[PDB]
Design a protein around this ligand. Structure first.
Ligand SMILES: CC(=O)N[C@@H]1[C@@H](O)[C@H](O[C@@H]2O[C@H](CO)[C@@H](O[C@@H]3O[C@H](CO[C@H]4O[C@H](CO)[C@@H](O)[C@H](O)[C@@H]4O)[C@@H](O)[C@H](O[C@H]4O[C@H](CO)[C@@H](O)[C@H](O)[C@@H]4O)[C@@H]3O)[C@H](O)[C@H]2NC(C)=O)[C@@H](CO)O[C@H]1O
Ligand SMILES: CC(=O)N[C@@H]1[C@@H](O)[C@H](O[C@@H]2O[C@H](CO)[C@@H](O[C@@H]3O[C@H](CO[C@H]4O[C@H](CO)[C@@H](O)[C@H](O)[C@@H]4O)[C@@H](O)[C@H](O[C@H]4O[C@H](CO)[C@@H](O)[C@H](O)[C@@H]4O)[C@@H]3O)[C@H](O)[C@H]2NC(C)=O)[C@@H](CO)O[C@H]1O
Ligand SMILES: CC(=O)N[C@@H]1[C@@H](O)[C@H](O[C@@H]2O[C@H](CO)[C@@H](O[C@@H]3O[C@H](CO[C@H]4O[C@H](CO)[C@@H](O)[C@H](O)[C@@H]4O)[C@@H](O)[C@H](O[C@H]4O[C@H](CO)[C@@H](O)[C@H](O)[C@@H]4O)[C@@H]3O)[C@H](O)[C@H]2NC(C)=O)[C@@H](CO)O[C@H]1O
Ligand SMILES: CC(=O)N[C@@H]1[C@@H](O)[C@H](O[C@@H]2O[C@H](CO)[C@@H](O[C@@H]3O[C@H](CO[C@H]4O[C@H](CO)[C@@H](O)[C@H](O)[C@@H]4O)[C@@H](O)[C@H](O[C@H]4O[C@H](CO)[C@@H](O)[C@H](O)[C@@H]4O)[C@@H]3O)[C@H](O)[C@H]2NC(C)=O)[C@@H](CO)O[C@H]1O
Ligand code: NI
Ligand code: NI
Ligand code: NI
Ligand code: NI
Lengths: 158, 158, 158, 158
C-alpha cells in the first residue's frame, strides 16, 4: 500500500510524511466555507489486492496557524462529516485495487468573527491529516502524514 | 453539554459526529411538503446549569443525494425559517437544564417541478446539520455533527 | 431480465410495454430545458448474472403530440448525448446483477419559437422509448416499450 | 450538410452523435486559461451550395465532470463570447460551400480559486455541444451532438 500526490511526492510502503500545497479562495466572508478537497491531490492503491485487503482511516486531523486561529471547520471523509479538528479516528475505507484511488478527504473551513485582514498566510502550514493504513493480512499499522500548506493568502473582509 | 438521539447514540461532551436515521413520508407529490423534524430525534442538555449557560446554533445545514438534487426548501430553527441549504449561522438557543431538550431543527422540503419516481433512496444521506455549542464560562466551542440518513424511499408520484 | 416502474407496473421476462407518467415543469421559456429523467422511474435487473450477461440499449426514442410539435430535444443515455428523436440505436449498457439498476435515460427538451400557450397537454403521450435487451447466452432479443405521458400541462410564455 | 472530425469520424446528413477526443494543456494554474478549440476538431460543409443555404447554431453547450465542478468560463462562437454552460442558442453561421469549414467553437476555461491537483481526468467527458443545422430550402432541422472528452489529465498546480 502506498500513496502519492497529484503532481509530486510519494509516501512509500511503510508510511512516512509528505507536504501538500493547496489553493484557497483568496477572499472569504463569515458564513462562507473555504472548501479544501484533497481527493484531487492524494491518491493511494493496494499493492496485492488479490490476496490482501487494505483499510484506510482518517486517524486525526489538526489545524495550525491561521486556520487554527481564524477558522472553524468540518471534515468530510468518504461521504460522512466530522468536526475539524477531529475528535476520533474515522471508520475505514477499503482499498482493493492496484489502480490509484483518491483519499476522499475534504475540509470545510469557515472564518470566526475575529478573522480579519490576512487570516491565512501564503506558504504557511494550515493542517495535518494522518492517514492510518492496516490490512487483513499481518500486523502492518502505518501512518501516512500529510502536512497541508496554503499556496496563497486568504483575506477575510473587515 | 452533550446530545443524544432517539433509540440510538450520543455525542458526548466535546462534540463529535453521529448518524441519524429518520423515517420519511413514502409519497410526496409536487406541491406537497416533506417534513424532516429533528426535534423528535436530537436531544441535548446542559451539564452544569446551576453555573453555566450553554449556547447552541445551527452553524450550517447542507443537502445531499436526492434531497440536494430533487427538493428545495427551508430550515426552521426555533421558530424562525431560513433557506436550506443554509447561508449563515442561526441565532443561539440557550440550554439551561440537565433535562433533555429537543434540538429545534426541522427541514421543510418540497419537490422540484420535474421530480418523479424515487426522489430519495432508502439508506441514503440526505443532510448534514452542524450544531455549534459554546457557553458563558470558558473558550469551549464544539461541533456536534449530525449526518442525516433516510430510512426509506420517498416517491414523488406522477 | 425484466423491468419495473418506480411505483407501478412491470414489464416481464420477454419484453412488452408499459405507460409511464412524468412530472414536467409547468412553465418553460425558449432557451430553457425541460429535463425528464427516467432513471428515477425505470429500473431493470439481470435474472441470472452468475451465468448470463444482459446488454441493454436505447434502440429508439420518438416524440409525440406537443413535444413533437413544440420542442426540440436531446437524449442522455448512460452518460452520452444524442439527438431526440434518436437517429440510431445507442451503445449497450451491461446489466450484471439481480439488484435493480435504473435505466439511465433522460430527455432534455427545449421549446421551438412557435411554442406558446399550452405546448404540452396534461395526460397526453409525449414520447416512446424502446429498450432493447439481449444477452451473451442465447438468441433472446426483446423490446421493452415505454410510453411516456405528461402528468400536467406545460405552458410556454407568449 | 454533414460534419467530420479530425482523424476520426463523421456525423452524416440528418445529424446524429459523435465523440470528440481533445488534447488539453497538462497544467493550468489558477488565473491561467485552458483553451478547448473545436475549430481544429470539427469541420462541416454544405452539400448543395449552388442551391441551398445552410444555417448552423450552437444550440446548447453543457459542462461535465471536472470542467463542470472545477472550471468557469465562456464559449466563443464565431467571434462573439457567451457564458458556458450556455443559456441561449447562438446566432447562425452560414455554410455555403462543399469545402470543410471549421465549426468556430472554442471554450475558454479558468480554474475555480479552490481547484488544485487533478482538475480534469484523462478519458473523461468534459462537455456536450449541440450543433443545430437548418436551411433555406425545407423543414430540415437536425442536431449534431458532440460529446467532448479530455485526452489527458489537466492539473491545476498549487
Ligand atoms: C495467490 C496466492 O494465494 N498466492 C500466495 C502468495 O501470495 C504468497 O506469497 C506472499 O504473497 C504476499 C502477498 O499476497 C506477500 O506479501 C507482500 O509482501 C510485500 C513485499 O515483501 C515480500 O515480497 C517481496 C517481493 O515482492 C520479497 O522480496 C520479500 O522477501 C517479502 O516476501 C509487501 O510489500 C506487501 O506489503 C505491502 O502491501 C500490502 C498490500 O497493499 C500492505 O498491506 C502492506 O502494509 C504493505 O504496504 C505484502 O506484505 C508476501 O511477501 C509473499 N510471501 C510471504 C510468505 O510473505 C505465497 C507464500 O509464499 O503463498 C501463495 O499461495
Ligand atoms: C456555584 C459556583 O459557582 N461554584 C464554583 C465552581 O463552579 C467552580 O468549580 C468549577 O465548576 C465548574 C462547573 O460550573 C466546572 O466545570 C465543568 O467541568 C466539567 C468536567 O471538567 C473536569 O474534567 C475535565 C476533563 O474532561 C478537566 O479538564 C477539568 O479540569 C475538570 O476537572 C466539564 O465537563 C464541564 O464542561 C462541559 O459542560 C458544560 C456545561 O454543559 C459545557 O458548557 C462545556 O462546553 C462542557 O461540555 C464544566 O467545564 C469546573 O471544572 C470547576 N473548576 C474550574 C474552575 O475549572 C469553583 C472553582 O474552584 O468555584 C466555585 O465558586
Ligand atoms: C452455474 C452453472 O454453470 N450452472 C449451470 C446452470 O445454470 C444450467 O442451467 C441453466 O441455467 C440458465 C441460467 O444460467 C437458465 O437460463 C434461464 O432460464 C430461465 C427460465 O427458463 C428455464 O428455467 C426455468 C426454471 O427457472 C425452467 O422452468 C425452464 O424449463 C428453463 O429451463 C429464463 O427465464 C432466463 O432468461 C431470462 O433471463 C436472462 C438473464 O437475465 C435473459 O438473458 C433472458 O432474456 C430472459 O429474460 C434464462 O434463459 C437455464 O434455464 C438452465 N437450463 C437450461 C439448459 O436452459 C445447467 C444446464 O441445465 O448447467 C449448469 O452448469
Ligand atoms: C439549380 C436549381 O435550382 N435546380 C432545381 C433543383 O435543385 C431541384 O431539384 C432538387 O435539388 C435539391 C438540391 O438543391 C435536392 O435537395 C437535396 O437532396 C439531397 C438528397 O435527397 C435525395 O435522397 C433523399 C433520401 O435521403 C430523398 O428523400 C430525396 O427525395 C432525394 O431523392 C439531400 O440530401 C439534400 O439535403 C441535405 O443537404 C442540404 C445541403 O447541405 C442540407 O440543407 C439538408 O439539411 C440535408 O443535409 C438536399 O435536400 C432535391 O432532392 C431536388 N428535388 C427536390 C425538389 O426535392 C429541381 C426540382 O425538380 O428543380 C430545379 O430547378
Ligand atoms: Ni505500488
Ligand atoms: Ni450530562
Ligand atoms: Ni427477476
Ligand atoms: Ni457532403
Amino acid at each position: 500500500f502506498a500513496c502519492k500526490t497529484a503532481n509530486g511526492t510519494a509516501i512509500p510502503i511503510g508510511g512516512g510524511s509528505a507536504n501538500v500545497y493547496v489553493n484557497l479562495a483568496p477572499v472569504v466572508n463569515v458564513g462562507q466555507n473555504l472548501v479544501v478537497d484533497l481527493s484531487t491531490q492524494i491518491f493511494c492503491h493496494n499493492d496485492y489486492p488479490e490476496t490482501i485487503t487494505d483499510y484506510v482511516t482518517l486517524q486525526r486531523g489538526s489545524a495550525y496557524g491561521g486556520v487554527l486561529s481564524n477558522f472553524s471547520g468540518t471534515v468530510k471523509y468518504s461521504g460522512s462529516s466530522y468536526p475539524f479538528p477531529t475528535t476520533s479516528e474515522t471508520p475505514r475505507v477499503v482499498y482493493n485495487s492496484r489502480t490509484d484511488k483518491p483519499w476522499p478527504v475534504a475540509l470545510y473551513l469557515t472564518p470566526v468573527s475575529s478573522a480579519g485582514g490576512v487570516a491565512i498566510k501564503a506558504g504557511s502550514l494550515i493542517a495535518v491529516l494522518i492517514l492510518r493504513q492496516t490490512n487483513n493480512y499481518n500486523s502492518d499499522d502505518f501512518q501516512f502524514v500529510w502536512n497541508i500548506y496554503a499556496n496563497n493568502d486568504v483575506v477575510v473582509p473587515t
